[PDB]
Amino acid sequence: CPLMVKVLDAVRGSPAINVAMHVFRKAADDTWEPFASGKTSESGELHGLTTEEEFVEGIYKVEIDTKSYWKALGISPFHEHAEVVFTANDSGPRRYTIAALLSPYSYSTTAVVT
Amino acid sequence: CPLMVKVLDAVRGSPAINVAMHVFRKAADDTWEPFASGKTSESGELHGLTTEEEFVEGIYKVEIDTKSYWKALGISPFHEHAEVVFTANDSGPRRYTIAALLSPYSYSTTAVVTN
Amino acid sequence: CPLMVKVLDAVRGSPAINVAMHVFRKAADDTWEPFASGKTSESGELHGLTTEEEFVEGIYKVEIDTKSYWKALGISPFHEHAEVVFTANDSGPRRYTIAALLSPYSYSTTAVVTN
Amino acid sequence: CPLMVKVLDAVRGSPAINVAMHVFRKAADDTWEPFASGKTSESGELHGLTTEEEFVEGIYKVEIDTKSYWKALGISPFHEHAEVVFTANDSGPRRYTIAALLSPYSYSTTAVVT
Ligand SMILES: COc1cc(/C=C/C(=O)OCCc2ccccc2)ccc1O
Numbered sequence: 001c002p003l004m005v006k007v008l009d010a011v012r013g014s015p016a017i018n019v020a021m022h023v024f025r026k027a028a029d030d031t032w033e034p035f036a037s038g039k040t041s042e043s044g045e046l047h048g049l050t051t052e053e054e055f056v057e058g059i060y061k062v063e064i065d066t067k068s069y070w071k072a073l074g075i076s077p078f079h080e081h082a083e084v085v086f087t088a089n090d091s092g093p094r095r096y097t098i099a100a101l102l103s104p105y106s107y108s109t110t111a112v113v114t
Numbered sequence: 115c116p117l118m119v120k121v122l123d124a125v126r127g128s129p130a131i132n133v134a135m136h137v138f139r140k141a142a143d144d145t146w147e148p149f150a151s152g153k154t155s156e157s158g159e160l161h162g163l164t165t166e167e168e169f170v171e172g173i174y175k176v177e178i179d180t181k182s183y184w185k186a187l188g189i190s191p192f193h194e195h196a197e198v199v200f201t202a203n204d205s206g207p208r209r210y211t212i213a214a215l216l217s218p219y220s221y222s223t224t225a226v227v228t229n
Numbered sequence: 230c231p232l233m234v235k236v237l238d239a240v241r242g243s244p245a246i247n248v249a250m251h252v253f254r255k256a257a258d259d260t261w262e263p264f265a266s267g268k269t270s271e272s273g274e275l276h277g278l279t280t281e282e283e284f285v286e287g288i289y290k291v292e293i294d295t296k297s298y299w300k301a302l303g304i305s306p307f308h309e310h311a312e313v314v315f316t317a318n319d320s321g322p323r324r325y326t327i328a329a330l331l332s333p334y335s336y337s338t339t340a341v342v343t344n
Numbered sequence: 345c346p347l348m349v350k351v352l353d354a355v356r357g358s359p360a361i362n363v364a365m366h367v368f369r370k371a372a373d374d375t376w377e378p379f380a381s382g383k384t385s386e387s388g389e390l391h392g393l394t395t396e397e398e399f400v401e402g403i404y405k406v407e408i409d410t411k412s413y414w415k416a417l418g419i420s421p422f423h424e425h426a427e428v429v430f431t432a433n434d435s436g437p438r439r440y441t442i443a444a445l446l447s448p449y450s451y452s453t454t455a456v457v458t
Pocket residue numbers: 120122129157213214215222223224235237326327328329330337338339341450
């Protein structure tokens with residue numbers, strides 16, 4: 001698992017469950033090509049997005065649908081979504097965990113690269 | 115200002131000075147159109163991006179060039195930039211302060227919205 | 230002010246207003262002595278806690294009563310309070326802005342330190 | 345494991361390894377009694393701090409020695425330590441994960457209660 005995402009809910013103190021996200025890879029035409037997607041599990045994690053052979057160097061965008069998450073909970077949110085845009089593997093393949101901590105008017109994102 | 119951005123550096127405990135950013139507004143054809151741009155001052159703040167008349171309802175994207183900031187300090191950061199996307203003025207004019215706190219492998223963004 | 234505190238509410242996207250806090254300074258016998266206290270204004274800021282003369286070198290603790298804040302909004306939060314402990318003025322007088330961002334189960338605190 | 349701590353380093357994008365912390369329980373005399381301690385593993389986690397029988401309702405303080413962590417890396421930090429003070433189990437025993445994300449002049453802490 002070269003790429004994993006973990007989402008936490010700072011209002012309820014819980015994993016953020018059933019949060020949809022899409023991963024895009026930057027194309028030579030400067031556009032974002034669909035690459036992977038899924039929704040977080042009961043533990044707030046999304047695994048199996050890609051494989052090491054497929055996960056080559058490049059620029060990736062993870063677009064997390066936070067707005068739908070807050071709407072499902074009946075809470076008015078600020079952001080349309082949370083985006084994490086990064087260059088992968090510029091040192092060669094390692095492992096990437098992207099964590100996002102969500103509040104209605106704030107989010108934090110951190111990468112753990114190991 | 116109806117729109118102000120403030121950026122802090124969590125490594126040095128200072129305002130993040132001379133950070134470039136670009137604001138876009140989503141057009142009718144779902145394209146991002148350039149709206150405004152600027153750089154943070156010595157206080158880490160960017161004022162005067164827009165006016166109440168020009169800042170109409172819509173979806174806005176603030177793209178903060180955090181990578182160039184970290185690179186100039188000798189640091190290779192994780193993120194290409196920090197992005198903030200939001201619907202503005204949907205229930206009438208508001209004033210928006212977007213705050214960003216920067217670390218090489220992490221950032222947070224908060225909005226303060228006042229009537 | 231050599232010491233100012235700013236508190237934001239990440240649930241409502243607003244300054245956190247009327248948040249109480251107490252500042253302590255570590256004494257020679259390693260006890261926390263009361264130093265100053267106050268509440269945030271409508272802008273979420275607390276100014277005038279101390280003066281340059283009184284704010285000597287030492288270890289300081291800012292105890293922000295986040296629990297009473299959340300309770301008054303009908304929310305049962307995780308933390309009893311948010312604490313910030315730091316050595317101040319160790320290399321001469323500085324100005325310290327402590328920023329706190331509050332959610333019911335999370336908080337962050339940053340320091341901006343300027344000469 | 346009713347109480348677990350996870351620490352991440354936001355400067356290096358890694359688990360914060362060998363971070364010492366002490367857990368205190370509030371005593372009736374208004375003082376903090378030593379309860380548990382340890383240091384984070386290679387994965388930035390500290391497990392086995394307590395057992396469900398021992399982890400009763402009360403006020404707990406986790407004092408994370410962030411200053412020594414930054415000093416070991418040669419980086420000047422702002423905080424003396426990071427403290428997390430909370431009331432446990434006021435709804436009865438659940439599971440507590442305390443996460444802390446560290447920068448030299450900033451820290452964030454979040455609780456995941458499941
Ligand atoms: C630590 O909580 C945060 C607060 C904020 C908001 C910071 C702010 O509004 O500015 C306060 C610090 C400051 C520095 C220089 C001048 C004025 C205020 C942003 C991100 C955060 O994670």
